[PDB]
């Protein structure tokens, strides 16, 4: 409907796959080459389904900060025959607050879903399902089961992936440029 939704759509159409693990179906953001991200609670194993194709996992790393605190991001390298468009130049370098974000989801349950979530707070610490978690972004939208892995964007930036909610608010793990240097 506007430039925010234009940016969100441009990312969803080229840089997302549907990932399935034994813990469900997730939106998965492809970042560059065969490297993608997913919430750590997806419990990625040695095999994952990518758009319903059995795919070997070449590497999976559950990120933690330098206090050894969960960040709820897992970086996955997929044994896929095709590379993602490189979007690392759209990743922020620092933790920040944002205006006017969109959360976008693409699964069997919720295809082509876009939500204007408004203002995004650098919330920081969250006890997420009983796990102390850092670098959390918060938006005031009643997000529901099925939205985990959803991409959080502003115009020109990919800032996070949706990892939880409390019924009134939604929570995303920060994406930072420094996660994806090679």
How does this model look, in words?
This protein has one helix at residues 3-15, and strands at residues 16-21, 24-32, 35-39, 47-50, 53-64, 70-78, 98-105, 113-128, 131-139, 151-154, 157-165, 170-174. It contains one helix and twelve strands. Helix content is 7%, strand content 53%. A hairpin with a 2-residue loop joins strand 4 and strand 5 (53-64). The protein is mainly beta and 182 residues long. The strands form two sheets. A six-stranded antiparallel beta barrel has the order 1-2-3-6-5-4. A six-stranded antiparallel beta barrel has the order 7-8-9-12-11-10. It has two domains: 1-15 and 85-182, no CATH class; 16-84, no CATH class. It catalyses: Selective cleavage of Gln-|-Gly bond in the poliovirus polyprotein. In other picornavirus reactions Glu may be substituted for Gln, and Ser or Thr for Gly. The active site is at 41 (for protease 3c activity), 72 (for protease 3c activity), 148 (for protease 3c activity). Residues 2-180 form the Peptidase C3 domain. This is Protease 3C. It is found in: Host cytoplasm.
């Amino acid at each position: 409907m506007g430039p925010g939704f234009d940016f969100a759509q441009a990312i969803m159409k080229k840089n997302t796959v549907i990932a399935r693990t034994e813990k469900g179906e997730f939106t998965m953001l492809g970042v560059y080459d065969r490297v993608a991200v997913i919430p750590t609670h997806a419990s990625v194993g040695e095999i994952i389904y990518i758009n319903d194709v059995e795919t070997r996992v070449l590497d999976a790393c559950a990120l933690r900060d330098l206090t050894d605190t969960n960040l709820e991001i897992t970086i996955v390298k997929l044994d896929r025959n095709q590379k993602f468009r490189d979007i690392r130049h759209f990743l922020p370098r620092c933790e920040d607050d944002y205006n006017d974000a969109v959360l976008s989801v693409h699964t069997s349950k919720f295809p082509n879903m876009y939500i204007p979530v408004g203002q995004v707070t650098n919330y920081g610490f969250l006890n997420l399902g009983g796990t102390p978690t850092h670098r959390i972004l918060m938006y005031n939208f009643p997000t529901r089961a099925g939205q985990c892995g959803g991409v959080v964007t502003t115009t020109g930036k990919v800032i996070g992936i949706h990892v939880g909610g409390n019924g009134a608010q939604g929570f995303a793990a920060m994406l930072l440029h420094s996660y994806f240097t090679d």
